[PDB]
Design a protein around this ligand. Structure first.
Ligand SMILES: Nc1ncnc2c1ncn2[C@@H]1O[C@H](CSCC[C@H](N)C(=O)O)[C@@H](O)[C@H]1O
Length: 262
């Protein structure tokens, strides 16, 4: 089931940001993409760094102690639960992915603080019931208490015909007031030619992609209260000292946004 003869998004991602969890097909795809867009590693790294600042924000500033992460990806230190449990050891996290390789490396995701709880579910976000009714999720999270729904660097693989906005809002629906939605949303607006070429490289490798305008990204957050600065390129979302050190706007193809459910 690993299917090493074709490229997979989690593995290309892991290859580009410096992990070992990839195969020849994934390196080949990554290298072809970087040829088209030399800033790919800056962008992919900035996304992963955005995840870290967003989770830190949620855990620390917003006091969220429960996370549901859709499209978890291959584990890479610090993982979301590691950031959340470092602020608050009792924090709970459910990780979810549909790439079989993630399950093989799930031990790192399950390595929780004793006070906290983590779980991993292999499931498709296009089937929210299989996620929401998952025993692993129900034994881990209390849906009557606030939950941060993290949907990071995944929605660009969800085409309009599947209603990405609907799928996301369906997952947020059972979460109570005070919950949050944090997303990173792929866009070609800042480097249309190079990002466009990379998107067609994913499409040519059976990984259809949907890049979005700022107005399309706003659709996900209708009725939710956006945390300032709203929907901005990820390197401009609550940056650290050196978060944008040598990063041009054209080198970042993700919007980042965090919002509270009223
Ligand atoms: N329909 C689906 N259901 C669940 N996971 C999916 C999916 N489509 C893609 N994915 C997963 O989404 C991940 C995108 S990579 C992003 C990983 C992580 N959220 C991060 O931002 O750092 C991959 O691991 C891929 O396998």
């Amino acid at each position: 089931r690993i299917d090493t003869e074709s490229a997979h998004s989690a593995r290309i991602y892991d290859y580009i940001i410096g992990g070992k969890d990839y195969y020849p097909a994934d390196k080949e795809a990554g290298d072809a993409m970087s040829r088209e867009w030399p800033a790919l590693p800056v962008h992919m790294r900035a996304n992963r760094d955005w995840m870290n600042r967003a989770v830190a924000h949620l855990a620390k500033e917003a006091g969220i102690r429960q996370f549901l992460d859709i499209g978890t990806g291959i584990p890479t230190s610090p993982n979301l639960h590691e950031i959340a449990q470092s602020v608050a050891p009792e924090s709970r996290v459910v990780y979810v992915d549909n790439d079989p390789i993630v399950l093989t490396l799930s031990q790192g995701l399950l390595a929780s603080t004793p006070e906290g709880r983590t779980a991993y579910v292999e499931a498709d976000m296009l089937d929210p019931a299989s996620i929401l009714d998952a025993p692993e999720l129900r034994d881990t999270l209390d849906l009557t208490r606030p939950v941060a729904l993290t949907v990071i660097a995944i929605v660009h693989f969800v085409l309009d015909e599947d209603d990405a906005v609907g799928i996301v809002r369906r997952l947020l629906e059972p979460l109570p007031s005070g919950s949050y939605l944090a997303m990173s949303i792929g866009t070609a607006e800042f480097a249309p030619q190079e990002v466009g070429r990379v998107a067609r490289e994913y499409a040519a490798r059976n990984m259809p992609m949907r890049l979005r305008t700022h107005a399309e990204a706003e659709e996900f957050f209708e009725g939710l209260e956006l945390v300032e600065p709203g929907i901005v390129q990820v390197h401009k979302w609550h940056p650290d000292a050196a978060t944008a050190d040598g990063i041009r706007d054209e080198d970042i193809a993700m919007y980042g946004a965090v919002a509270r459910k009223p």
